[PDB]
Amino acid sequence: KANELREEKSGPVTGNNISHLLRDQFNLRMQKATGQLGQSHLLSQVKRDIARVKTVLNQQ
Amino acid sequence: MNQERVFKVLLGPHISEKATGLADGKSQFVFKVATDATKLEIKKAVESLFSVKVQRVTTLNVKGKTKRTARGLGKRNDWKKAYIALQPGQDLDF
Amino acid sequence: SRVCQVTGKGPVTGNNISHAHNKTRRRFLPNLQHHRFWVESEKRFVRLRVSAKGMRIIDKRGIEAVLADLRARGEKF
Amino acid sequence: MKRTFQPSTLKRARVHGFRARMATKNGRQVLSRRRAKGRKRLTV
Amino acid sequence: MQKIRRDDEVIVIAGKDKGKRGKVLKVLADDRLVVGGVNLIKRHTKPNPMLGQQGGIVEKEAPLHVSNVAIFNTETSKADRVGFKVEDGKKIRVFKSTQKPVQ
RNA sequence: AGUUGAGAAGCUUGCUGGAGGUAUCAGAAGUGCGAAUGCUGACAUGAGUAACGACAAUGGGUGUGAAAAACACCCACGCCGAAAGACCAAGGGUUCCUGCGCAACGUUAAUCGACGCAGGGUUAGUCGGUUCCUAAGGCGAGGCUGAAAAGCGUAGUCGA
RNA sequence: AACCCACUCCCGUUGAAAAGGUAGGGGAUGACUUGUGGAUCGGAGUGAAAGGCUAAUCAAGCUCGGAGAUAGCUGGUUCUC
RNA sequence: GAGUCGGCAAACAGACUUUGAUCCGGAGAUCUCUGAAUGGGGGAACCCACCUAGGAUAACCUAGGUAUCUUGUACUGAAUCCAUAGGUGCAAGAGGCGAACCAGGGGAACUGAAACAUCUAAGUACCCUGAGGAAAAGAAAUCAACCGAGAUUCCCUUAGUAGUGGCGAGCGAACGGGGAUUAGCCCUUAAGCUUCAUUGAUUUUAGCGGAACGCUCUGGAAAGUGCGGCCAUAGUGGGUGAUAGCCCCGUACGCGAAAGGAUCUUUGAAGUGAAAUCAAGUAGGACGGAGCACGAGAAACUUUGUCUGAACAUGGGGGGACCAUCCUCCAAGGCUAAAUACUACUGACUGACCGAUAGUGAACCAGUACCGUGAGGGAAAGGCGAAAAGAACCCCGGAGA
C-alpha cells in the first residue's frame, strides 16, 4: 500500500523501487506473450503498484 | 535512455511459424515492440535486458485487421514488429 | 475604413426616393480627405485621414488637443 | 465514358479537409453545424 | 444496511416452496437470493470434454426474490421482519416482533 | 355461432388469449376511410414467362466428396501473345497466404472463391516519401483598403 | 497504327451500357493528345458561339433557410337515421 | 458494511475483500495526441526544430521555455542635429465554443393589395459585431392645463379609438387610470459594484433511522377469495410468480457533513465607478435621408451624410406649422438594484400527453447505416418465460439445415 511507501522510503528508495517493479511488469509480459503465464492477476496489480510509487513521488 | 523505457520497449517474442524457423536457421528473433520505438531503442533494450550483442534490427509496422461484426466494423490495434539479428553463437532465453 | 479619425463619422445608409417614390437603397459617405497637420510641439507633420468637419474641429480645438484624445482612444497618429 | 468522381486523396483534403474548412469563416461554421447535428466525422 | 445476508437461516414466504426453511448462499445484485435446498431446477447441460462440466441432468438451486423470504426467528418459530437498532456505533439488526437481536 | 334493434350498432356464447377491463351519467377530443397517379410495410398478377452479360471451345480420365458439366491433378483440344503477358503511379484497403467451412453472397450446382471463421504474412543508408530546394498558386507579421465579415499584398514560408 | 475523335449503317432501346458495340470512317508534328498540381461560380464564371458547359441537373447549379410562398386551379374530405 | 473485478455478455479464468474492498460524495495527482492550438510548418490527430538547466561513452534523455495582437514598462535608436518611427526584453490581458435571451451594424423576397410600381410582407428572415446572467433603459431641457403629476422597465386598460394610408390593402397612438417593482447618488469625487481578508448564518455536493398480516380458498404462483386484526404527520408510489398501507425498496416524518461550492450577512483593505470643475463645432438652420403609429404632409419633436452655426439665469428648451402670453423644465458629463426576457444544461413533482407507421430523426450501438465531390440529406430495427429451468439423451440427415 501507500503508507508503507510514504514517509518510510526516500527519494532513491522509491526511485529504485519503480525500476525493480518495472522488471516485474516486463517479465510478466514476456511470460504472457508465450504460454508461460498462469496467474493473470499479477499483470494488472503490477500496473497499479507502479502508479502509486509514481503517486507518492509526485507528492515526494 | 532514461532508465525506464527499456522495459516499455519490448512487448514480447512474436510467435509464428516464420518467427520460429527463422530463429532456428538464422539467429534472428522476432519481437513485438512498442509502436513508437526507434531501431536504436529496441537494440539497446535487447543488449541490456538479455546481456546479448545485437548485430542488426529491422522493423515493421503492421496494420490491424478490421473484423465485421453486427454493430458495424471494428478494428484491432496497429502494432509493431522488430527482427533482432544477433551474432552467431548465442540465442535469447526467457 | 471610411471613418474619420477625429469625429468617428462612418458611412450611413438611407434611400434614393425617386419622383414616383421608388426607394433605392444607397449609402451616405463622409467627406474624407487626407491632410498633413503641423504640430509645433513635435516639429513634425502628422498625416491624418479626416472628414471635412473633422478639420473644423482641428481649427477650433487645436491639433495638439485633438491628438491628445486620438491616442486616448488609441489610434495611429 | 469516364464518370464525375475521379478520386484523389490530395485534392480531397485541400478542398474538404479539416485545415481547409477551418481556414475560412464560412467553412469554420460548416464544422460547427456539423458538430451541432452531432455527426461522427465532420470532415469527409 | 440490508435485511438479509449469507449466514442466515431464512424461511420462504409465498413461493413454490413456501414454509421451507433454508440458508442463504448467494445474494445477487438484482434483489435475488440463492437459498440452500429450495427453488430447485434441473439444468439439461450438454457435457464438456474439458474440465468445466460433465454429465446430463444437473439439479441446482435457482435464485428467489428478496421479498419471497423472511428471517426465521428460532425463538417463536415463525417468519419475522427485521429492523435496525442504532446505538453507540453498533448497528445491529433486530427483530420486530420481539425486538431482540438477529444472531 | 346465436340473438335483438329503423340504423349506426348491442347482447349472449364455443374455441383461441393469458392480465387486464370499465354498468351508468356527465366531461374532453389525434373520434369513424375505399378512392387524394395518397404515405409505409406485406403480398399478388404478369409467370415458373424473359433472361442467366460478347458467338476463345471444349472433350475424356482420376481424385476427393453426402452429392462434381463448373474444384484439384493428368492427357488432349482451342484462345490471347504491343496482351487476355509481365510491371509502376494513382485509387482501394487485407481483397494476399494457410488450416477449417458453405448458411448467406456467386445470375445455376459448388467440395471451389475476391465469401465466412481463426491464425499468419509487408524487414531498406541506396527503391518510394519525410528531411533540402523552388514553379503555378495558396497563406501572409506589419502595411494599404473596406458598414462588418473581410479584400489585396510586402518581408516571409508553404506548395511537385 | 497507338492515341484522340465521333461521319454512316445495323444491333441494342426492360440495354452488357442513364449514350455503348460490330463493320467501315476523320485527324494523327500540331490552333495536337494527355497526366499531375493550381486559377476563375450562380444575373456569376467559362464559351474557335451551341443557350453550350459549370459533378448523369443549366434561358440561371446544388443545398439549406424565408416557407406550410402563392395557387379565382386540380384532386380528395372517413358513422347512422 | 458484504460483497466485488463497468455495459452489450452469460459463462470462464486469475483474483481482491470484516486488518473492511466494489460502490458513493469532497479534495488532490496523472492527463499522450489533435482542436483557439499558441515554437515552425501541415493533407486535424502528423512532420521538423531552437534556447536554457541537469544527467548520459562517437545515439540521446529529463524538466521548463520558445505564437500573435493589445495595453503597460524598461533598454536600445534611422533617414536627421535633437527625438520620433522602428528594434529587443519583461509584466499583464485578449482570441475559441455554446440552444435561446440582449444592444447594435447591414438588410431581402415570395406574399397581400384579388394586376402592379407608392405601400405591405417587415426592419421580419438572414448575415455580421459586441456584452451579460440578464441586457438595454433610467433620475426629467418629461408630461400636463392653469389643477396637477414626477426616473426607467413591465402587465392591464383607454382602443382598433385619435391619427395615418395609391385615405387602397393596411398600419396604429397618447392623455388619463388600475397594477408589478421601490433607491437615487455624483463631476469640491458619491451611492453602487469588483477583488481579497475576515463575522456569524443559511444552503448545496452522500447518507442514517423510518410503523403495522395472519389463517383460509382456488391456483403453476396470492397481493385476489373468505374471515379476523393492525398501523397511519406513512392509503390510489415503484415490483414482488395474478390486484399488497402491514413482503421488499420507499413514503410521511425526524436526524446528519472530514472537506469543498454557492448565497446572505458583519468590517476593514486595495480598487473601480471617474468623465474633471455642470458640458460648443454643441443647440439651432439650409440641403438630402431615416425615425417617431405619422407615405415631408400645415409637420412639430428626435437622429445626421454634406454645408453652416449661437445665447450664457435681467439665459436656454419644450407645450405637434407659427406668433404672443402663461405653465413646466436645464440639453450638449456620467453611474445605478428590483419588477422584465430566455433555457442548450441540472434536479424534483406533474399530465383528460404519446405508446414502436405513435412519441424526438433515434425506445434497439442514431445523426448510425445508406446517398452525395461537398455543404447537405437521412432510414429501418422493441416484447421467450415468474425463473434459462434456453431442450441431457435417442432417431433420420451431409459429426448438416
Tab-separated table of C-alpha atoms (C1' of nucleotides) in Angstrom, chain B residues 14 16 18 39 58-60 63 65-67 83, chain F residues 93-94 96 117-125:
chain	number	residue	atom	x	y	z
B	14	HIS	CA	6.279	-12.884	-31.501
B	16	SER	CA	4.698	-17.739	-35.559
B	18	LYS	CA	8.009	-17.827	-39.660
B	39	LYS	CA	15.672	0.866	-34.006
B	58	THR	CA	14.913	-4.341	-38.940
B	59	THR	CA	11.369	-3.141	-38.198
B	60	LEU	CA	7.793	-3.439	-39.417
B	63	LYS	CA	-1.849	-2.745	-39.664
B	65	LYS	CA	-7.339	-6.179	-39.052
B	66	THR	CA	-10.888	-4.919	-39.405
B	67	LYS	CA	-13.439	-7.520	-38.348
B	83	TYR	CA	13.619	-8.605	-36.208
F	93	G	C1'	-7.909	-1.177	-48.003
F	94	U	C1'	-6.133	-7.176	-46.023
F	96	C	C1'	-2.545	-11.574	-50.314
F	117	C	C1'	-14.359	-18.016	-39.026
F	118	A	C1'	-9.300	-18.380	-36.872
F	119	G	C1'	-4.099	-17.930	-37.256
F	120	G	C1'	-0.152	-15.871	-40.332
F	121	G	C1'	2.207	-12.560	-43.691
F	122	U	C1'	4.504	-6.476	-45.675
F	123	U	C1'	12.083	-6.347	-42.803
F	124	A	C1'	15.846	-0.804	-46.678
F	125	G	C1'	21.885	4.495	-45.599
